[PDB]
Design an enzyme around this catalytic site. Structure first.
Site, short mmCIF file in Angstrom:
data_model
loop_
_atom_site.label_atom_id
_atom_site.label_comp_id
_atom_site.label_asym_id
_atom_site.label_seq_id
_atom_site.Cartn_x
_atom_site.Cartn_y
_atom_site.Cartn_z
CB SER A 210 -4.88 1.64 3.46
OG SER A 210 -3.81 0.94 2.85
CB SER B 175 -0.85 0.08 1.31
OG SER B 175 -1.89 -0.91 1.19
CD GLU C 82 -4.07 -2.38 -3.42
OE1 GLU C 82 -3.47 -1.39 -2.96
OE2 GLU C 82 -3.83 -3.56 -3.00
CE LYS D 25 -1.16 4.62 2.87
NZ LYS D 25 -1.89 3.25 2.97
CB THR D 26 1.79 1.58 7.23
OG1 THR D 26 0.37 1.58 7.29
CG2 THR D 26 2.36 2.59 8.22
N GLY D 27 2.24 -0.33 4.79
CA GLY D 27 1.60 -1.30 3.85
C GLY D 27 1.91 -2.67 4.49
CB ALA D 28 0.57 -5.54 5.61
CE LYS E 14 -4.32 1.65 -1.36
NZ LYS E 14 -4.43 0.41 -0.57
C1 TBE Z 1 -1.74 -2.10 1.73
O1 TBE Z 1 -0.70 -2.56 2.11
C2 TBE Z 1 -3.04 -2.84 1.50
C3 TBE Z 1 -2.76 -4.29 1.83
N1 TBE Z 1 -3.36 -4.78 2.86
C4 TBE Z 1 -3.71 -6.18 2.60
C5 TBE Z 1 -2.81 -6.91 3.60
O2 TBE Z 1 -2.78 -6.64 4.83
O3 TBE Z 1 -2.02 -7.82 3.24
C6 TBE Z 1 -5.29 -6.23 2.62
C7 TBE Z 1 -5.72 -7.19 3.73
C8 TBE Z 1 -5.93 -6.48 1.25
N2 TBE Z 1 -5.28 -7.49 0.42
C9 TBE Z 1 -4.15 -7.44 -0.28
C10 TBE Z 1 -3.72 -8.72 -0.43
N3 TBE Z 1 -4.61 -9.50 0.19
N4 TBE Z 1 -5.55 -8.74 0.70
S1 TBE Z 1 -6.07 -4.70 2.96
O4 TBE Z 1 -5.15 -3.94 3.83
O5 TBE Z 1 -6.46 -4.16 1.67
#
Ligand code: TBE
Ligand code: MA4
Ligand code: TAZ
Length: 265
Positions: free
Chosen positions: A105, A45, A141, A209-212, A48
């Site tokens: 996000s 993320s 996404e 801005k953080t992401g995972a 973004k």
């Molecule tokens: C930004 O980093 C959006 C990613 N978040 C993921 C995640 O935490 O891995 C979510 C759960 C959505 N997504 C992407 C991959 N699998 N689900 S959510 O934060 O949109």
């Protein structure tokens, strides 16, 4: 806290994962400290912020307006759309979409916006035109958070993400109002800003801005500095670790802590 690179080692050893980091002066691009800064890591993320950078570039060229309202259907939504799911009847302005995407996000907002700059292709072209020859977006996404080992799609390097954010925020690439808008979005982050601000020492500016993603992918791009000023860009990514989200969160916090405690002139 240990010195920043010592903390970074400890984190990689405890997580069994790779950490990437750069701390750069926003004003000049002076690099203060770095660790796997030329290695690729999934952006998640954090992209973004760059995406809304491209939308701002279009507004500045007369091709787009932050006020232009976009109307979309239920079938266009993707996972995690806390804001965009609430406006199916009334749509959202291009400006609101960037705020949902960066401050909340929201993923559909990101997709709707991505279509306006030509999809992943068009956002990669914009980067090349801004002189970033490394970062590359190739998926939408939520597939861009997939993070497979050795896959270069949807990744950046710490030093390339820092140099690009610096160019969007300070060169003569965005108008001044656009630079300020991009900055204000990151200041207004609602996912991690508040939390982070609350544990920072008094005096410290924070914008972020953080992401995972998958396989432990975790990251943050931020503006930070003492004396209430956006002094430096700090980019920290983590990838390929089996650890829990809580541990990943703590390790990045511990590096942030080390960085802050041993901040140099
Ligand atoms: C930004 O980093 C959006 C990613 N978040 C993921 C995640 O935490 O891995 C979510 C759960 C959505 N997504 C992407 C991959 N699998 N689900 S959510 O934060 O949109
Ligand atoms: O630097 C000296 C300071 O050390 C302590 O604060 C600690 C601690 O209270 C901690 O909570 C925080 O970071 C915790 C949260 C870090 C989150 C950063 C993650 C993001 C932050 C912005 C980009 C980097 C990554 O910093 C320090 C530094 O040791 C306090 O004593 C404080 O009074 C003091 O001013
Ligand atoms: C975003 C949410 C639904 N959600 C989960 C995955 N994708 N969307 C939902 C909403 O605001 O719609 N919120 C809650 O309520 C807590 C959060 S959530 O994370 O449960």
């Amino acid at each position: 806290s240990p010195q920043p690179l010592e903390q970074i080692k400890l984190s990689e050893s405890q997580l069994s994962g790779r950490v990437g980091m750069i701390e750069m002066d926003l004003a000049s691009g002076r690099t203060l400290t770095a660790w796997r800064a030329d290695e690729r890591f999934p952006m998640m993320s954090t992209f973004k912020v760059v995406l809304c950078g491209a939308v701002l570039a279009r507004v500045d060229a007369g091709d787009e307006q932050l006020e232009r309202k976009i109307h979309y259907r239920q079938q266009d939504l993707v996972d995690y759309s806390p804001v965009s799911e609430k406006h199916l009847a009334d749509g959202m302005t291009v400006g609101e979409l960037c705020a949902a995407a960066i401050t909340m996000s929201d993923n559909s907002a990101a997709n709707l916006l991505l279509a306006t700059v030509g999809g992943p292709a068009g956002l990669t072209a914009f980067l090349r035109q801004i002189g970033d020859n490394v970062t590359r977006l190739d998926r939408w996404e939520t597939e861009l958070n997939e993070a497979l080992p050795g896959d270069a799609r949807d990744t950046t390097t710490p030093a390339s993400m820092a140099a690009t954010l610096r160019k969007l925020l300070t060169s003569q690439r965005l108008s001044a109002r656009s630079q300020r808008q991009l900055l204000q979005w990151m200041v207004d982050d609602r996912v991690a800003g508040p939390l982070i601000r609350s544990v920072l020492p008094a005096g410290w500016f924070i914008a972020d801005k953080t992401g995972a993603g998958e396989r432990g992918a975790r990251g943050i791009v931020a503006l930070l500095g003492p004396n209430n000023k956006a002094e430096r860009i700090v980019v920290i990514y983590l990838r390929d670790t089996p650890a829990s989200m809580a541990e990943r969160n703590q390790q990045i916090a511990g590096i942030g802590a080390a960085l802050i405690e041993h901040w140099q002139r």
